[PDB]
């Protein structure tokens, strides 16, 4: 299709231009955190982010070639992974903290407010640290986030597009001056991290379901349907 005829540089420009905005949370500094208030904040943020995620996905080359059912499936499968890689990316320059929003920067002790969350907070911090050490580039980040969208629910068009994104990653690394061996090693390191992002999403989804069944906060109708897709 159209995606298949893009150059690497055109692929990168497409993906950078498609980046969603960074949103603020509705954080209210007048009152202390509770499990409920914390969950309310994160849920409201994620919900608003989802709407921009949907607009972004439609701009990932090859995605709109899919039937609506297939588009729904991929986003249902990938949405928390995608929120998560975004979080880890914007948190890179904040060692020991997660930048949920410019006005919501949390450390792990604040994660302890919500039952079961600090364990995932620690995994997210570690992933952020790993990206920081590897000096993940923004161009690399948008490639990886698009890979998550196309890959996580995929089990030929999708695979051809994924191949193009691989081409684009390698192109970027070559341009940055990495040796040919360094290129395939870095490709591999980055793609193995996607397995840890999958892991984090699955653990988080399990807990999100637990919270819904305990009525800690009201989930949006959209989030309810996204969550139900995993059960």
């Amino acid at each position: 299709s159209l995606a298949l005829s893009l150059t690497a540089d055109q692929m990168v420009s497409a993906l950078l231009d498609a980046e969603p905005p960074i949103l603020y949370s509705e954080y209210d500094p007048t009152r202390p955190f509770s499990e409920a208030s914390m969950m309310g904040l994160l849920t409201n943020l994620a919900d608003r982010e989802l709407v921009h995620m949907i607009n972004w996905a439609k701009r990932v080359p090859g995605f709109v070639d899919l039937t609506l059912h297939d588009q729904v499936h991929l986003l249902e499968c990938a949405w928390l992974e995608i929120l998560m890689i975004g979080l880890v990316w914007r948190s890179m320059e904040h060692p020991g903290k997660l930048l949920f929003a410019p006005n919501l920067l949390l450390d792990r002790n604040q994660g302890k407010c919500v039952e079961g969350m600090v364990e995932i907070f620690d995994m997210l911090l570690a992933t952020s640290s790993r990206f920081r050490m590897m000096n993940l580039q923004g161009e690399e980040f948008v490639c990886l986030k698009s890979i998550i969208l196309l890959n996580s629910g995929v089990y030929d068009h999708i695979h051809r597009v994924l191949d193009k994104i691989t081409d684009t990653l390698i192109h970027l690394m070559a341009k940055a001056g990495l040796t040919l061996q360094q290129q395939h090693q870095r490709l591999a390191q980055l793609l193995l991290i996607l397995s840890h992002i999958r892991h984090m999403s699955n653990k988080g989804m399990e807990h999100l379901y637990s919270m819904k069944c305990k009525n800690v906060v009201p989930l949006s109708d959209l989030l309810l349907e996204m969550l139900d897709a995993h059960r």
Binding site: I54, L68, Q71, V72, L75, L222, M226
Partner: peptide, 10 residues
């Protein structure tokens, strides 16, 4: 149909 299904069209 799903909400997501609707939002994908708008």
């Amino acid at each position: 149909h799903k909400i997501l299904h609707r939002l994908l069209q708008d």
